[PDB]
Every structure is written in C-alpha cells, then in structure tokens.
Design a protein around this ligand. Structure first.
Ligand code: FAD
Lengths: 278, 287
C-alpha cells in the first residue's frame, strides 16, 4: 500500500522502522529474522538505509516477500542521473510503491549527477506521477538559517512530496517548532517525527557533529555522568525516547519513524513501555 | 501598530497581557499604575477583558500610556447596531487591534442565547469589521486547542475555526491551556486544514484551587493529572498553590519559546504577581 493512503486511512498512529546495511552475511540473516519478529508490532513500513545499489533492490524484494511494506531509500550522491533513474526503475519494477528521495551525505555532486533531493522527487513524478508515494527528509534543527532551510523544504515539497520523515531529534520542542515554520509556510503534508533512542555514549559525537541533533541539558548530564556504564546509557536513552513519543502521540502526530540499530531492541522497548505492542 | 504588522516583522516572540475590569476606582488607578510600570517591558499589546462605554475609555487610557491596546469586542447580549456603535467608538479612538469574540452567557448562566437582533458567531463580527473597516484594523479571534465546551467534536470545532479565519482573521489567541501537547496538536490539526495565520498561545498560571472549576467547565481546559494531584493536595495553602501554578507556567512557556511560538499571551488577574513571577524566572524581567 502507498504510504500516502496508509496515512489518510487514519487507523491510529503509524509506526515505521529504519534499519542499517548489515555488516556481514550472518548479520543480514539476523536483520531479516528481526523483520519477521517485527510483524508483532504491525509496522506500517520498513526500510534499510541506502549506501549497495543492487543489494538494496534485493532487500526491497526480500521485505516484500515477508509481507512487509518496503520504503526504498534512494540518494543522488556519487551517481549519474542515468544510474539513479536505473535504480529507480529497478525498485518500481520489483513492486516498490514507496520511495524516500534523499541527497546523500557528501556536498559535491557526481559530475553527471543531481545536486538536490528535489531533483530526484521531480524525476520520480515525471516518470511515475501518482503511481508511487514519495517522501523526503525534514531537518527540524536545520543545518545557513532555519528560515533558508524551510524555503529549501518548501521547494522539495512542491517538487511532489506526499510526506516527510524527520532527522532524529531528542528535544520535541525543535520538532514542534519545525512543524510551526511549515504551517506558516503553507505546508500541509504529513511530517512524521524520526526517533533514535541513545543506546551508547559513542553515538553522541555522530548525533551532534554529523546529524546536527542537539542533546537537551537534562539528557546530556544523565548520559555523561553514567558515560562508563553501558546498561545505564541504554536505560537513559529508552526512558528519554518513551517520554518524547508519549508527548508526540498526545500532540496528535500521524506516526513515529524509529531508527533501529539492527541488534538493538531499544525501539521495541519504547513501544512496549508505552503499551503499544498489539 | 497593527498586530498583523508586528507579527510579519518577525523580531522574536510578541509578549502580550490581558487584565480584568477593575472592581472600584482605587483598583482602576492601581491597574493603570501597573500598566505604566509594564511599558518598560515593551509588551507587544495589552488588553482589559470586555460596561461597553468603560471598555472604550480603558482602550483610550492604554493608548495615553504609549501602550498598544487590543480591544475585546463581543456580540453577546447586544444588538447588531449596538455592537457596530461600540466597534466605531474603538476605531475612532485610534484602536487598530480588535479581538472579535462571541462572549460568554451572563453571570451564573451556562447556555448561550443570542440577543434577538444580535450576532450569533464571532465570525459574523469579523465579517462586519472587514466590510466596514477593511485593513484599517487588524482582527484576531479566540482559538480552542481542546475545543469549545459547546462544540460536538474537535473536527467540527476546527471547521468553525477555519470559517472564522476565512471571515478575515489576521491572527488568533488560544484559550488558556495547561498541557502543551494539546496546543501543539491543535496547531497540527490547523496545519492539516491549511490554516497559516499566526496562533498565539494563551497562558494563565493557576493562582487558586477555586479557579479549576472555571477552567475545566467554562474555559474547557483539561488539567494534567500530575498538576491536578498537586493542586488537590495543597487546596488551602495559597502560597504553595501560587508556587505550583507559577512553576507549571514557567515549564509550559519555556517549551513554547523553544518551539519558536510567535508570542505568548498572559491572562493576568489585576492584583496577581503570578505573571511577573513567571517572567522573572524565564529571565524576561529582573528579579
Ligand atoms: C483570547 C480570548 C479572549 C477572550 N476575551 C473575552 C472577553 O473579553 N469577554 C468575554 O465575555 N469573553 C471573552 N472570551 C471568551 C469567549 O468569548 C468565550 O469562550 C465564548 O464562549 C466563545 O467566544 P468565541 O469568539 O470563540 O466564539 P465563536 O467563534 O462564535 O464560537 C462559539 C461556538 O459556535 C460554534 N460555531 C462557530 N461558527 C459556527 C457556525 N457557522 N455554525 C455553527 N456553529 C458555529 C463554535 O464551534 C463554538 O462552539 C475570550 C476568549 C479568548 C480565547
């Protein structure tokens, strides 16, 4: 089912899961076993982050074969326009109905490639129109100004987005604040909050330096005073994500997208502790 | 200054204050001393809740202090012609900012019935103002994040809100709320309905247990379980009820400001130090 339609269907909040490319063959089999277990939570869609162009088409097929609904990540970084159109064709031919159009981390484009995620959105709409559902990344904490960032989002939405999924955040006020900039800019599409519980102290450099997320003071303090206790970090991260999602659901979000480490049960723990395992 | 122009300028959050009709002449002079002391804070605008001749004079006196008045104007218990006459009295006073309200039933009555030659909906007053004054005035209306108590559902309430905006609102101020998620959820419903106008959160710190009945039944605000717990085990200690209410409002407003609201609108009892205490602890006024 197209995510556009799943969102209109209004049958409670949608819970989605994003996993990561497996490290080795046994990790890939453990990832698809974990996907089979995940049917317990009735996930509205599942994805594996895209670098592995041929692997990702086969993963989309494997997810389908499990009776799950794949969201295929497609990036424009380090590919020609022809290369990106080819992977696009391969996904939709395989029965993929849902695409997440991303620029990719490094920015300097491939010399015969696209520069902006909006160009990939426009390509999909040119080739497939409304036969597919297309999402893009939203950045509640931005990167230039938040105002310039929001104009770049508006542009991408207007290229033909059906929905957006946020970058991970730990401070819900930043997500609500992005939704308010979007409303003032006339953006009405569904914007799903993305949540990654802190599972280890090592992650905080990635989160701040790479993903640009901010760590609220009360969370940062608890983490850095327990920084050498892996069990403590995990409990701090799950508790923080439980409180975040509890407030997001009270604020009528249409769903929550969970960034899940392949081996980590944290996202499953968050939904169990909220009483949301069916 | 028209509030739609203050909001467009985008210079950080607007802070506004709404006070209550004074009870006697000493109270009236003490209220206007308070407003003279507030001008140091550069409030975006100030109002007294809506005696129709008195309300026009109060708007004049606020202007006399160099403050920007928001004239509250209701349709309850007045003919269309009486509402039009009061409206004209505000505009001719140089009042540029109107808040078009239906108004409550009279004191001790709980069922709204329109005056037989009167308006029924605030949207009718918004349309009157736009037909008669156009862009000479900036017009706001009430929004209800938890729904009007007399609305049948949140989706019907939102439909009615949209109709009021389409009548010619430049902005809205919410009913008071205690649970920020209900405010954020209202903005998300407004966003899904294509409502883009600025919507300013209305905050009233709990200053007494007795107020909770007004808040839940007349105003239609829910009280979160933790706060309700704490209030209903401190009922007869007004020093601590004050402290509970101020600390809850500080935590609300802190989150609203981190969520980049376009401003905060504080409902302030005339003698109450609660708003001042909230501003001090937020670092917006000196201790
Ligand atoms: C910031 C603020 C300031 C206030 N100031 C004052 C004040 O100074 N004096 C005072 O007495 N009160 C004041 N109030 C209270 C307000 O007047 C009451 O809440 C009143 O009950 C409703 O006012 P309103 O303008 O929202 O009404 P309206 O917008 O007319 O709504 C009244 C009801 O009618 C419904 N409705 C609206 N349009 C339609 C339609 N076309 N068909 C059917 N149903 C419809 C609504 O959903 C709602 O249930 C204030 C409230 C706020 C939030």
């Amino acid at each position: 089912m197209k995510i556009r339609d799943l969102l209109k269907a209004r049958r409670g909040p949608l819970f989605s899961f994003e996993f990561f490319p497996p490290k080795d063959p046994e990790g890939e089999e453990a990832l698809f076993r974990t996907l089979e277990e995940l049917k317990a939570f009735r996930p509205a869609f599942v994805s594996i982050t895209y670098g592995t162009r041929e692997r990702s088409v086969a993963w989309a097929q494997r997810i389908q074969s499990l009776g799950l609904n794949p969201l295929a990540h497609l990036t424009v970084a380090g590919q020609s326009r022809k290369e990106v159109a080819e992977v696009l064709h391969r996904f939709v031919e395989s029965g993929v109905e849902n695409l997440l159009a991303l620029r990719g981390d490094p920015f300097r484009p491939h010399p015969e490639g696209f520069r902006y995620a909006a160009e990939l959105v426009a390509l999909i709409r040119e080739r497939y129109g409304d036969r597919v559902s297309v999402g893009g990344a939203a950045y509640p904490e931005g990167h230039e100004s938040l105002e310039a960032d929001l104009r770049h989002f508006k542009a991408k939405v207007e290229a033909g987005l059906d929905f957006a999924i946020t970058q991970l955040f730990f401070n819900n006020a930043h997500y609500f604040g992005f939704l308010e900039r979007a409303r003032r800019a006339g953006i009405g599409i569904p914007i799903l909050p993305g949540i990654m519980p802190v599972t280890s102290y090592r992650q905080l450099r990635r989160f701040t330096e790479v993903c640009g997320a901010s760590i609220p003071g009360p969370l940062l303090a608890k983490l850095e005073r327990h920084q050498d206790d892996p069990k403590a970090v995990l409990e701090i991260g799950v508790e923080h994500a439980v409180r975040q999602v509890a407030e997001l659901l009270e604020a009528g979000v249409e769903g929550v997208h969970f960034y899940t480490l392949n081996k980590s049960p944290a996202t499953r723990m968050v939904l169990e502790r909220l009483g949301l395992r069916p």
